[PDB]
Design a protein around this nucleic acid. Structure first.
Lengths: 218, 424, 55
DNA sequence: TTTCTTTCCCACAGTAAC
DNA sequence: GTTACTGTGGGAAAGAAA
């Protein structure tokens, strides 16, 4: 707790000259707080003094996850630049930093993670790749980068939904178009034999239906 | 007609005080025997549909205190098979708080591997309630009495899950009785059916309650303990044995599957089993044995059927009175993570069926909310000041509750509870 | 701080705009959706009424 | 050939309406 | 008693996966 207060808000270094102590409520370590409150200097010091950058807190998040969630560019650079750091870390629900990067509309961390060799076709416990999340959220730029760096465009999640399908359900016209551009298979049914066109017609997403029907065919 | 009303601060306070939520709820099997030709193999157990919650009554009263027949304020309801071109069957909910769907079945005309039950539901005066669906159900062309490996699960009971148990007298659909529970003891009603926790135990297990369960799928030969998911009363230790041709085997390692006839041996009393005597549940011994030292013949009445069970559950509240639309689709909030801290705290919510028209409320405070997608939503933790006059920082832990609220006033309760804490 | 803050203003505005788009996509379609549901509710309610008369 | 899985068939034994 | 019918469960037939 004493080391944690300096990092979370000379102090970090002097106490060190405890460390991996987890809190009772959240279960985060000093590194986690440094990441969350986005205190860059503190995270560097904690790492310097050989800290474990992969301790999971009560929900499975490591400091890197905390880093993306809090959009802390500095702590994030520091953790990815760190070798020990697991980039394909996993929360209890299977969520990965590459995925939070897709979801929270954070500038560039998704590509930095990709460039620093994170697995792109990794998936959450529901079996959703970042490309799937990218479609749900209609994050076109992330969708392009995931695709250029070899994502599986026709990947199916536990419910047999492809990324094109989630875009069809939410009506992500721009991402839906990009997936089509890349020849995404528009004929892959979900677990209840439903075409993305079908999910789209139901939600009255007329443009996505227009695209499924006439865009980049044969 | 009265324009949609934004839930007000005061209305929220009232709700937090009273809290008379209305909640639908659907219990059912995870599997279903597909019916061929013009047959009809009804879903067993029969999908029950309880209507829990003090709110349903408050709604009944409110409707009448506005000129409604006993017949105008009666929740109605039909059950069906997802998107199938058939006919939804009606459930009679008069006076009853629940109702089973005794004659549901899936033809082979339907090619889907899965489907989920659709339960349409409105009030007598055609006022609309919503459409709630069951968790997915898998279609099987016939149970597999053959061998079952541990790669194609979803078909193997697993310590922790729930299951229903029913006995079928001489092949007559009208006999079927399910292990149930009422008045503290185990019945065998051919009316209701209970879901049971089927915990796996290591042979070196103790006596009664306060025992420890261990993960793992269930194969015959293990010591399992069945508990009533509702009442709590449970059956003393047992050993599920694969059966066939009236013989309760002892030498069987095979993993228990879906819709598998099996007998339940007791706590090494001797060789006594658990049976149904066309009435209630009473002891037994299974005299026959001289066939082999590992193939104890048993009397027809304890060869139950094991089937795994799930439960879909939705709950809402009319926080601003009647609404033009249905309360369906209901928001389930599975995970609630904090994002950052202090001056910027935000909250990522993940769950199902979210929609652009919800704001999340922290106690009686409405917080800005950004819709990401059906399963993800973000919102902004409101300054601690909004809960403690002076406070420019969190002087002490203040735990308010989190809750989703549609734009027309429906309020969907969660269970989660954001707690403000001092920034270390 | 202005550079980082500027990145922050930029992120929320993006979330905010995305939300605004989805809500409007959703609301614009509400009438079409609500009228289609009521049409079905009517059919059952009509049937619920006749089922009562048969008794 | 094997080994299953999915479709067919058909006869117990209850119901229902005479 | 007589008749016409209908879920079920068990086993044969048709395919489909080794």
């Amino acid at each position: 707790t004493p080391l944690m207060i300096a990092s979370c808000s000379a102090v970090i270094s002097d106490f060190i000259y405890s460390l991996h102590n987890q809190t009772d409520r959240t279960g985060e370590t000093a590194l986690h707080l440094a990441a969350r409150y986005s205190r860059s200097d503190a995270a560097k010091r904690l790492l310097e003094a050989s800290a474990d950058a992969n301790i999971q807190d009560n929900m499975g998040r490591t400091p890197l996850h905390a880093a993306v969630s809090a959009d802390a560019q500095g702590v994030f650079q520091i953790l990815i630049r760190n070798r020990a750091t697991d980039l394909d870390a996993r929360m209890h629900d299977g969520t990965t930093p590459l995925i939070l990067a897709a979801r929270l509309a954070v500038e560039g961390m998704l590509e930095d993670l990709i460039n620093s060799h994170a697995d792109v076709n990794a998936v959450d416990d529901l079996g959703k790749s970042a490309l799937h999340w990218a479609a749900a959220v209609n994050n076109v730029d992330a969708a392009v980068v995931l695709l250029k760096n070899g994502a599986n465009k026709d990947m199916q999640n536990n419910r047999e939904e492809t990324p094109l399908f989630l875009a069809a359900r939410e009506g992500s016209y721009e991402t839906a178009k990009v997936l089509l551009d890349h020849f995404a298979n528009r004929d892959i049914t979900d677990h209840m034999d439903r075409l993305p066109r079908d999910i789209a017609q139901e939600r009255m997403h007329h443009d996505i239906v227009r695209l499924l029907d006439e865009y980049n065919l044969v | 007609r009265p324009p949609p009303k934004r839930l007000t601060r005061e209305a929220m306070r009232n709700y937090l005080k009273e809290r008379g939520d209305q909640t639908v709820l659907i219990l059912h099997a995870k599997v279903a025997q597909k019916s061929y030709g013009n047959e009809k193999r009804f879903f067993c157990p029969p999908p029950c549909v309880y209507l829990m919650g003090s709110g349903w009554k408050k709604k009944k009263e409110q409707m009448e205190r506005d000129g409604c027949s006993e017949q105008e304020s009666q929740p109605c309801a039909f059950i069906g098979i997802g998107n199938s071109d058939q006919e939804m069957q009606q459930l009679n909910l008069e006076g009853k708080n629940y109702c089973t769907a005794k004659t549901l079945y899936i033809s082979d005309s339907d090619k889907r591997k899965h489907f989920m039950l659709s339960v349409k539901m409105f009030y007598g005066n055609s006022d609309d309630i919503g459409v709630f669906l069951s968790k997915r159900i898998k279609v099987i062309s016939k149970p597999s009495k053959k061998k079952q490996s541990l790669k194609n699960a979803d078909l193997c009971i697993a310590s922790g899950t729930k299951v229903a148990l029913f006995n079928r007298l001489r092949s007559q659909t009208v006999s079927t009785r399910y292990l149930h529970v009422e008045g503290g003891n185990f019945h065998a009603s051919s009316q209701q059916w209970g879901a049971f926790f089927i915990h796996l135990l290591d042979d070196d297990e103790s006596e009664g309650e306060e025992f420890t369960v261990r993960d793992g799928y269930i194969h015959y030969g293990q010591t399992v303990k069945l508990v009533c998911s509702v009442t709590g009363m449970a059956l003393p230790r047992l050993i599920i044995r694969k059966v066939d041709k009236q013989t309760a085997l002892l030498d069987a390692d095979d993993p228990v599957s879906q819709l598998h006839k099996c007998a339940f041996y007791l706590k090494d009393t001797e060789r006594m089993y658990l049976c149904l005597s066309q009435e209630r549940i009473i002891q037994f011994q299974a005299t026959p044995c001289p066939k082999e030292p590992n193939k104890e013949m048993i009397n027809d009445g304890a060869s139950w059927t094991i089937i795994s069970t799930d439960k879909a559950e939705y709950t809402f509240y009319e926080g601003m009175g009647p609404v033009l639309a249905p309360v369906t689709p209901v928001p389930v909030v599975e995970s609630l993570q904090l994002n950052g801290g202090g001056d910027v705290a935000m909250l990522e919510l993940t769950g199902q069926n979210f929609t652009p028209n919800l704001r999340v409320w922290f106690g009686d405070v409405e917080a800005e909310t950004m819709y990401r997608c059906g399963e993800s939503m973000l919102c902004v933790v409101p300054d601690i000041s909004a809960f403690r006059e002076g406070w420019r920082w969190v002087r002490q832990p203040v735990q308010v509750p989190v809750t989703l609220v549609r734009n027309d006033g429906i309020i969907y309760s969660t269970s989660l509870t954001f707690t403000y804490t001092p920034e270390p | 701080h202005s550079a980082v803050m500027e990145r922050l203003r930029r992120r929320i505005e993006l979330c905010r705009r995305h939300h605004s788009t989805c809500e409007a996509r959703y609301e614009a379609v509400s009438p079409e959706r609500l009228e289609l549901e009521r049409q079905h509710t009517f059919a059952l309610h009509q049937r619920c009424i006749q089922a009562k008369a048969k008794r």
